[PDB]
Structure formats: structure tokens, C-alpha cells
Amino acid sequence: SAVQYFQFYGYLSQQQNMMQDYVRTGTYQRAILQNHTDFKDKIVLDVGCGSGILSFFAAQAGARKIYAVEASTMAQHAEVLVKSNNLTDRIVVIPGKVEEVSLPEQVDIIISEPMGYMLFNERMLESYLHAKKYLKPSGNMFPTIGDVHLAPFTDEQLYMEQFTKANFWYQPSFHGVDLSALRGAAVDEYFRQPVVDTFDIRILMAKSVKYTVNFLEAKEGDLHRIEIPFKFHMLHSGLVHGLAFWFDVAFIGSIMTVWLSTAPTEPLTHWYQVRCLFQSPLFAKAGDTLSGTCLLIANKRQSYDISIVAQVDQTGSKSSNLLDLKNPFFRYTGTTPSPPPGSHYTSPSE
Amino acid sequence: SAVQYFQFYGYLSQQQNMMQDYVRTGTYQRAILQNHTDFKDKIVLDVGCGSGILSFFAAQAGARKIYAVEASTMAQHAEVLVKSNNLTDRIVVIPGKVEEVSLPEQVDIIISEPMGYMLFNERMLESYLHAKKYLKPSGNMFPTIGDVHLAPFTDEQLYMEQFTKANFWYQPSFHGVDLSALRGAAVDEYFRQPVVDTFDIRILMAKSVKYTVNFLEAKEGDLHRIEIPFKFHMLHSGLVHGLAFWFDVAFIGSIMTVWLSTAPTEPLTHWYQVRCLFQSPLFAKAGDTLSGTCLLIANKRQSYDISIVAQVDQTGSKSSNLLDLKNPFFRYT
Amino acid sequence: SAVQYFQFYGYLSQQQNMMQDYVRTGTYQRAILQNHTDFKDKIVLDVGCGSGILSFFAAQAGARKIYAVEASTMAQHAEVLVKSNNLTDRIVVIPGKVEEVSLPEQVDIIISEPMGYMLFNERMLESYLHAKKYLKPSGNMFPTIGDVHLAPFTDEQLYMEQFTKANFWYQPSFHGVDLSALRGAAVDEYFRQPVVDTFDIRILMAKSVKYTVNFLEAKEGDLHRIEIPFKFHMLHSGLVHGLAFWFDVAFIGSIMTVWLSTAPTEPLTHWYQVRCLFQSPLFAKAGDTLSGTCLLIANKRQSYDISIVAQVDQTGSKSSNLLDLKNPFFRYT
Amino acid sequence: AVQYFQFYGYLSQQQNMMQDYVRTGTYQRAILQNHTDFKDKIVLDVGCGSGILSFFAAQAGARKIYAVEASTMAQHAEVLVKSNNLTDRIVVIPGKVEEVSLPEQVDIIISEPMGYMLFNERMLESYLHAKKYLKPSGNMFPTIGDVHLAPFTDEQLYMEQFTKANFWYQPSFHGVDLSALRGAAVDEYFRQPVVDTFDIRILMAKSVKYTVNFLEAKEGDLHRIEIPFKFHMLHSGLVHGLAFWFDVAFIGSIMTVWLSTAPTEPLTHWYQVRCLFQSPLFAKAGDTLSGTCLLIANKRQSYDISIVAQVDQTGSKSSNLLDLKNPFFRYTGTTPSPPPGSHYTSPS
Ligand SMILES: Nc1ncnc2c1ncn2[C@@H]1O[C@H](C[N@H+](CC[NH3+])CC[C@H]([NH3+])C(=O)O)[C@@H](O)[C@H]1O
Ligand SMILES: Nc1ncnc2c1ncn2[C@@H]1O[C@H](C[N@H+](CC[NH3+])CC[C@H]([NH3+])C(=O)O)[C@@H](O)[C@H]1O
Ligand SMILES: Nc1ncnc2c1ncn2[C@@H]1O[C@H](C[N@H+](CC[NH3+])CC[C@H]([NH3+])C(=O)O)[C@@H](O)[C@H]1O
């Protein structure tokens, strides 16, 4: 539901949680300030301003007028901050959906933070693209482009954990009740959940594949159906338990390009990384090719139905999987991720 | 939304989380089996059967026919278990809301698990009471009664934990931005959050006060406005940081009465306990009396508007508070 | 106020308290005796001799004549010690303020112990500098130079101790009275308090910054306005709760240079260390630079109005703070 | 006078006084339980500080409350009067009660003018001075003040003074002979009244009480306070000095309420005060310890204390001169130990 989505972002604690992500917030601030010529005396649109922080960064960069659109009740709080920071003549908070509000004029640049898990979750990118109707023909988008990265991984424990949980139902006398008939359904449910957390990069079995969305060119409708083909050339031999997902966005300004990355090679963000499991894992040897497709289909719950089909070309062994991005499993514990066993090529005792 | 509510309970993982609470499940089973004569050859209604477990307990106790009503998709799973457990002739799953379905006959006993945090959360108690339209005049209800217990507590660490998070909004220059104008709003939000977890009973400053709901006598409408008065006789001197809440239910059967407790003196359940924090603690001395009321008003979001007003009678120190069950702080780890 | 100062130093217990600081007294004695050649057959001025201890040290080092100026009543006690130690021909107690007395001749070397908290507190340094009107050209001063050290620190416990105290004025119903309107005033007051005590150096977030006062060159008026710029290169990521202050002085003699340090890495002195708290801490990452200035303005109440302005340059996060040396928080155990 | 009022300008001290539950709670109870003395009456709060007592008076139904305050605290009180929506009932008057002007005479005066040994800080004089604004038959809250004194024995406290002074009794402190100042150091320590608490078992006789009736007394009475005493010794031993504490009474129309700082009561921010004899006196149980404690007002907002004590049966005499404005704060928080030899039955 949309109501619930906007209720979630009405809480100051959630805004705070996002603001406290230093990578995110700091990178946005740097991206805006270091490209000051894209903002000085310009007209700006902030799509989904929340607390208003990005608009304040735009004001720090010298913007003449900033329209800050916000659909949740947070809009009232942003208005309080615009007043208390004495920026009433430069920032105008507009309550409502960017799809339904009216803007007084066209803008030189649109800024937003529309990314969700594996980039697309929450389907805010559509609104962000929708807002382009207010952009002048020479206008810019901050972020300008988004890269989704995919890679196959091996993680036997993560895989087996699912069955360990579902096997609760495989008992003939739970307080006298035979639960076993539901074991299959429980297994399916667990494997339909994308897994949100981080991992050691050594579990990755091949160089990532990149899928790019150019926000200046893309159309809203483009995000209702996203087909991501992939061809992985395996670097390590073993069992492929699924695909890991992360993303980067780039702010391409007149002075410099600034990147915000959620890669597992980078410090963690509140986006972590996402893994989609194969219910049937695939064996591959170094040198093999793992080919297939990831298809994201927009649904009515502000999310996507994910279909992943993969095959090892040399053996023809196939795996097909369906996942629901709206019900991810938050697994992150804070514990340092262990590398796969058999990572020692020299004696650990030396 | 009701949609949201029933979507939450459609997941098998959630059913599993509830089922693996051994105190809960075991206490229900014992309550039913030790009172088998209340079930033997009887007609039963299971309000919100979920996986169907309570209906299976009713069947174990010899019930002749069990109508198991369930509004979520879980209903389909319960049907599978009834079939696989060879009980098609005794357990009948009725998919839908208990407020909207039709039952073939009146029942001798209603069984359910309608309790949430502080007993009243999620507002399933209303549905449970509504189901009484299907109850024969001499019929029973399992649970028969529910007691919510309140007690004042002292916990500096918790108070400062919430305060520290709220003070983020005190910053005059977060990346150059002055957030302070929202500090009052932030404190209000954080302290409206019920704190769900457990605690050592040594933090309790007075004997608990009890508020009883008799499910046999109560009417549905009664749960639209719940006024809970309290008068505590302080046993320890110190700072009262808020009120702790937990609950007991009793299954009053023909053979014996069995209690299910979520008290902090008892083994932990998936309900843990709930605490309401005061934005400013109240100082009290041993022997003082802490008086006031907890008022719950049903709202349009499947929940309650809750106000807690407490005062130290001797000094007139008053605290007024709002609690939002829609936004709990799950602190347990 | 000057009256109060000189009343304070009139008590023998205070003199005792200072004399029993063995690092201080011992370091002074070593500084003077190891550089006996700077005193042998010389004329000395002891600014604020108190008990006279430093003058006795000068006499031990072979000085021909020592003028020991003291404005408090302690002057009479010193004279008793000069007589009982049979040093009347060498130590001459001059009662009065160094700014007002008359000395018969110019001196070869000035000795004093004019340091207070953060070096500058109590404002005896300007009197010490004023005394140079009696110094022969190329004459020496013990101490010769003073280094004030600054460093950012993180200490959540201290911050919340002070914030907890300030939150008393947050109460909306203290014995029925709403105090909250004064919370802003209370927070401002408590956080204006320098925190006097020691700490583990592990709380420091960056290499200290040095500010040097050369007592041979500095002029009296210079201590009426002191501007200390600083640029810290952050070595650790975290919350900067404020700035830590300490000081060293050097006695640069002809035989050797002797240092008296009050650094937290050194044995404790009665000066401890001083910390200034920010009402709101500043977040910083390793590699960032924390820049700003500490401005001390002499006020008419024998103290300084202190302003500390600091910012995290990468984010523009600013903190402006006031410190009141007149109202310290003595925290050491 | 400047420093005195500078001290009370800080919110932290007001807070320290407010957090003393005995004091604050007892004032609140005294005022609220005697509501007929306040309901629709004209009130004067002498030295209102934060204004707390005025708020108590307002809770009790006062028609108008004049709150006089000489320190900067006056504005903080003004902020609280506005924020508590009581501007038509409470009027904050910045300035000294001796110098400001009130338009009306009042029915009752409230204040908290007590210091160490009751009299320290000399605020009672201001309090009594304020009676120029009191209607005839008007009341005083507190109405009377009782100072209690009793002889004590505390060998450790006594010997402590010499232990501290003997720092100066050494011939080569870093090469310096300090000995000549030892006598001066000893006299200095013994001039300091000792502020802290103690076990009531160190007290050697029932206290003697000196009462000041604030309804009857004049300001001038407090310039010279002569407190005669005659103790009937209950325990035998060495008498090292006199212990001091005080009570005040709020004598209302409905009931009388007491605020005590006695060592038998929970501790207050006033603690208790002990004045040492530089020469102790031996006494037997049953002997009489007679003499006088004379408090003489000085210009330092305090008193010079002269204590002359004698054991009548032996004629052993001791005299002491003390400065109440420079007391030694000795309190540490440690549970006070009773004197050794307090066991009458086997401890094992
Ligand atoms: N079509 C739309 N019209 C208006 N407002 C919208 C919106 N879609 C999302 N929002 C808000 O936009 C914010 C989203 N974001 C990120 C959430 N992952 C807030 C980012 C904020 N600008 C910041 O950087 O702190 C939230 O407050 C959302 O209610
Ligand atoms: N008015 C209503 N009509 C029908 N069904 C309802 C309902 N209100 C709740 N439910 C279901 O009842 C179950 C609740 N409970 C506990 C949730 N805290 C499960 C009870 C089950 N019998 C068990 O004990 O495992 C869930 O499946 C809910 O969808
Ligand atoms: N302008 C001045 N003219 C004369 N006397 C002064 C003075 N300023 C301070 N004093 C005294 O100097 C002493 C200071 N010092 C340091 C005290 N923090 C005494 C130290 C003494 N010399 C020692 O080392 O034992 C005190 O007695 C002060 O009254």
C-alpha cells in the first residue's frame, strides 16, 4: 500500500536513520557542493525531500529557488526546518505526491534519493523519472545514472539455513500434530525472500555484470519491466547458490562526477547487499559460463516480482527461481563475515 | 489496514514463531486436555485458527465438531493439515472473518488466542467477543478471563537510550543544517514508543495493579474505550521512569483452571513485556502513592489512541503521556 | 574580587595544598638548583612568593639577594620563615602587589609560579609579565616559556553526566511546577563549566595543537586578548564531545632546560586537566580536519570570557561554545 | 554582598536546593496543609530564588504573591511565572528586600532564610526586616527557629587537625625549615567550623535549644546572639567540642509543620556543624558542662563564634574563637562510625 509507505517515512526516526548514513548523506553533500556551478542561482526540484536535507545542501551550493516536494507528514517538519534555518525565500516545501502537485515553474536540476534495495525496491525511481516533466531541456538529474551489479555466489551455510528453518514443519508429532505436509510450502516461502545483509567478497565466483539506467534518458514505463541478461565467466569452481546484487549511482556534474557505491568492497550503507538464492544450486568449474536472465516485474505493492533463470552452458544444468522483493529477510547481525572454507593457499600455522 | 494485518499472519514463518513459543502452545494444550470434558462430544468454535493447532487440541480432547475460522491465506494451510491428519470429519475450516462468515450451528465453547502486547494490542479481542453470537447460553470461552498488570519501574539506562536517540534532533549544525527546532517533536515521537522486551523484576517499585476483562460477560463495544485506573503504594524511593505492562489469561474449565502468564517472574514468551516511558521521570519516596489512569480509545487504524496520566499524590508531580502501539521499540536481543 | 583572590591565598592550608604537589615543587627546585649558575651571586625577583619556597630555592642556588613580593597576608608568614631559616641578609620580603611596590634595584632573573587552569586562569601571568619592568636587559625568567596544548576528545559518559544534570530543568511538573521554560538556560549554564579532572589519553581524537607564550618577549597587554587558532587532523572516527586542555612550562637555564608538564601522559598535578564540552557533539571521520579558534578575552572579574568555535571542514558542521572559568566542575573522584 | 548574590545566580545551586526533598517537600506540605493561611491572601516571598515557594503559595490559593529577589535569578523566576500562566498573581520584584518597594501590606511572609547553624549567611535579618510590610497579626512561614547545640567526643576529628598542621613541623621540606609556622597552622584549622554529619552516639548530652520567634523578634536581636548552656553529661569521656543543628516550625491555622536538620533525621544540604575545642575537657557522666556560645555579626555576611565552656565540678575550662564564614566541608558520604567501646553486649 502507498499509504503505509508514506506512513513509514512520516517518522523522524526513519529520516534520522537515513541521515545517519554518512556515506549516503556525505556523498550527496559532496556531490552537490563540489558541483556548485550546477546549482548557483539555479532552479532546483527535490523529489521526496523528507527532512529537507538535500534541499539545504542545494541552498549551501547557492541555488536561488528549491522546490521541495514531500508526500508524507514529514513535509510539515521540513517546513519547520526551512523557517528555523531562515531559508523561506529560497526553499518552498510543497506537500503532496510529485505526480499530483503543481510546480510554479520549470527547473534547472532535479535532485533526489530514490534508491532502494538492489536499486529498484520501493519503486521511487518511477516518481523520480516522472518529475522530468518539470525539467528544462538542458536540465540535469542528481543522481544522473544508476548501475545495478550482479554476481553469482557460493554460501553453503546460507543455503542450508533455509532448510534448517523449514524442517520445523517436518515432524510427525508437534504436540500430537503431524506438520510434515506443509514442509514444502515453508521451504518455498523462505526461498522467495531476498536476503539483505553483507558478505566476504571471496564468496563471489565471477566478475560482476553491470546493468545501467540512465536517468536523463529513461522513461517511467521502462521501470515496470526490467530484463537483466547475464553471462558469467566462472573464476572459481564450486556450487552456485544464487546471485548477489548491489548498486552504484553517479552524479555527473559540470565540474566532476561523484559516485555513491554500495559494493561489498565499500563501507556499508543502510542498503547493505542483497542475495537471491537458487532453490536448486548449480555446479560450475572455473572457465565455465553461467548464463541467464533476471526479470523484474512491477507489482501493486510498490515492489517487484523477481524471476531468475540460470544455466551452466557447458553442462546444461538449469535453475529457475521466483522471489518477492517486498518481503526480504533482514539477516545482518554485525558479525564479521567469514571467507569461504578452503581459502588458505599457504599454511595458516606459518 | 485489516489487509496488512491478515497479510502479516499469512506467512508460515510467523505461525512457526508463535508455535515455537512452548509456554504458550503447551499451556493451551494442557488447558484444553486437562478440561477434556468441556470438549468431549461438543461443538467448538476456533476464532482465528491460524495453522489450526488449537482445533487439533480440541479434537484431541474429543470434540465432535470444530469450526475453525480464519481470514488469512493460512486457512489454506490449515485445510492441508486437517486432511493429512485424517480429521476431515471433525475439523471444518471456514475461510473468512468471524464477523462475516456463517456457521451451521451454535457452539458449546469458543477457543481462541486473541491476546497481543499489553493484552489489547492488534484488537483481536473484539472479534473474539463478537464470536459470542454463536455461543449457546450455558457455553464457555477459552480463555475465560484476561488480566492486564501494571507496575511502575525505574530504569535509567533505557530512559537515556531513548533520550540519546531523540537528542540527534538537538544538533544546531548537522552537515551545516540546524535541526534543533524539531527536538520537541523528536522527543515526543520516541517517547510515544512502547518498549517491548523483558527485564529483571528488581526494577519494579511497587506491587502491580490489575485490570480484569471477563470475556464471558464483556461485550464487543466495551473494548472501544478502556479506562484503567491505578493507585500504587511505592515500596522503594527513587525515579519512576514509567509503567510496565504484562498480562495473564485464565482458562476456567469444568475440571480445573489453568493460567497462562507473561509476567517477568515467569518464563519468557513471544509477548515479552511492554514498558511505557515518561518523557520526564517522577521522583517518589517509599510510602508515597502514585495515582492515575491509562485510557485506550479505539481509532480508525486498527489500533488505540493511548494516554497515560500518572501523578505523585504527595507532591502533585504529574506526568501525561501518549503511547503509540503502531510504532513499538523492539529492544530484545 | 582581587580581595577574594588575595584572601584565598592568605590561608596556610592553601599554601600547604600547593607545596604538597611534589611534581610542581620538586620540578621548580630541580629547575633552579640544576641551573645554579643562573642564580650564583645574582639579584632575584620572586613574583608572588607565598610561603617563600621559590626564594629559598633561589637562596640554595647561591643568589646574593632575593626580593620576594607578596600581596596577601602570607607575606608575614614568609618573613617568619626567612628569620627562622637565618636568611635575612639574602631574602627580603616585600609586602604588596608587584604592580605597586618599589624595589631598590633591577634584577638579573625573575622567578614565579603564575600558572592556573589552562595556563591562563587566575590571570597571574600578566602580573608576572608586568614585573619585567624590574628586569635588567638580557635578564632571565623562570618559567621561560609556556605551552598550552589543545586536543579534541570523545567521552559520552561525561556528556551524559552533564546533560543528565541539565535535564532537571526539563521537568514539566516538579512538585507541580513547570520548569521546562528554563531548560535552555540550564543547558547553557552547565555546558559553560570547564570540567577539571584527568582522563585516559585514549579519549583524544587527534595529535594535540600547541600554542606558545614566550615570557621573555610577551607583553602584559597581550594576555588581555588571546587568539588560539587550531587545525586538527582527525585520527579516529567518532563523536567529538569537546576540547581537552593542558599545559607545559619550560625553565630554559644556562646549564639545562627543565620542563614542568601537566599532560595527561604525565603524573598528576593539582592542575589536573581541563575539558570544554560542546552542548552538541560533532561527528568526524578519520582523515577529516577540525578547524577553529579559541578566543580568551580578559574580563573585569579577574577571569576570561572564553569562546570556542570549531567546525568539521568536510561537512561544514559548526559548534560555537562559551566557557566560564569562574565556575568549574571539579569532577576528580 | 556581590559574591553572595553571584553564588545564587546559578541555576545549579537552585537545583541543588530544590533537590533537597526534605526541605522542598516540607515547605510544600507546610504551605498546602495550611491553605486557609493562603487562600485569597496577599503574600511576600523573601528571596524567592527560582520562585518555588511562590508557586507553592499559588497552589494554596493566594490572591497575590510578591516575589522579591536580589540576584539575577529574578529573571529566571520571571520566565517561570510567565510560562506557568501566573502573571496576574505572582509579581517578581528584582532587588533587595531592604531596598525595593511594595504597594500593599501582606497577610503572610514566606521565606527560606536558614543557613549553617541556622544563622549563617545572615538572611534572617532580611526576613525580619521584611516585617515592615506585614499586616498586624500577619504570619511568618517559618514562624520560629530552634538552634540546638550539644557536646561531642570525636578523637579522630580532633587529632586530624594536628595531623594536617604537622605538615609544617619538619626541619627540611625541600631544604626549608617550616616548623615556625606549625602553631599558626594549628590555630587556623581550629578556627574552622566543621560541616558534615556524624553518628549520634558521639553526642555526650541532650541538646540545649535556643529559640528565635520570628513573629516577635526584631532584626537587631540577630546582631548579637548569646546562647547560654548547661549540659548534664550522659556519658563520661573527653569533650572535643560542640555540635550544632537547627529546626524550623511553620505554625499555621490548621497545623504546625516541622523541618529538622537534626542528626537523628535524614540528612539535608545543611548537614550539621561542629565547633572544636582546641583543648578538650574531661567530663564524668553526671557532671555539668556550662558556658556560653556567643555569635557576633561581622561585615562578611556571617558570624564570629565565641565558645566558653567549663566543667563545673572540676573547674576545667576551654575557650574557642571561630569564623563561620570560612567553614571546612568535611562530608564524604561514608557511613559515620560510632565511637569505639559502644558494645555493651558481646559482638560475637
Ligand atoms: N512520489 C513521491 N512524491 C512525494 N514524496 C515522495 C514520493 N515518493 C517518495 N516520497 C518521499 O520521499 C522520501 C524518500 N527518501 C528516501 C527513502 N528511502 C528520503 C530521502 C531524503 N530526501 C534524504 O535524503 O534524507 C520519503 O520521505 C517519501 O515519503
Ligand atoms: N476476526 C478474525 N476473523 C478470522 N480470523 C482472524 C480474525 N482476527 C484474527 N484472525 C486470525 O487469527 C490468527 C491469530 N492468532 C494469533 C496472532 N497473535 C493465531 C492463533 C492460532 N490458533 C494459534 O494459536 O496458533 C491469525 O491467523 C489471524 O489471521
Ligand atoms: N600581582 C601580585 N603581586 C603580589 N603577589 C601576588 C600577585 N599575584 C599573585 N600574588 C601572590 O602570589 C602567590 C601565587 N603563587 C601561586 C598560587 N596559585 C604562590 C606559589 C608559591 N610561590 C609557591 O611556589 O609555593 C599567592 O600567594 C598570591 O597571593
Ligand SMILES: Nc1ncnc2c1ncn2[C@@H]1O[C@H](C[N@H+](CC[NH3+])CC[C@H]([NH3+])C(=O)O)[C@@H](O)[C@H]1O
Ligand atoms: N535581602 C534579600 N532580598 C532579596 N533576595 C534575597 C535577600 N537575601 C537573600 N536573597 C535571595 O534569597 C535566596 C536564598 N534562598 C535560600 C538559600 N540559602 C532560596 C529560597 C528559594 N525561595 C527556594 O526555596 O528555592 C537567593 O536567591 C538569594 O539571592
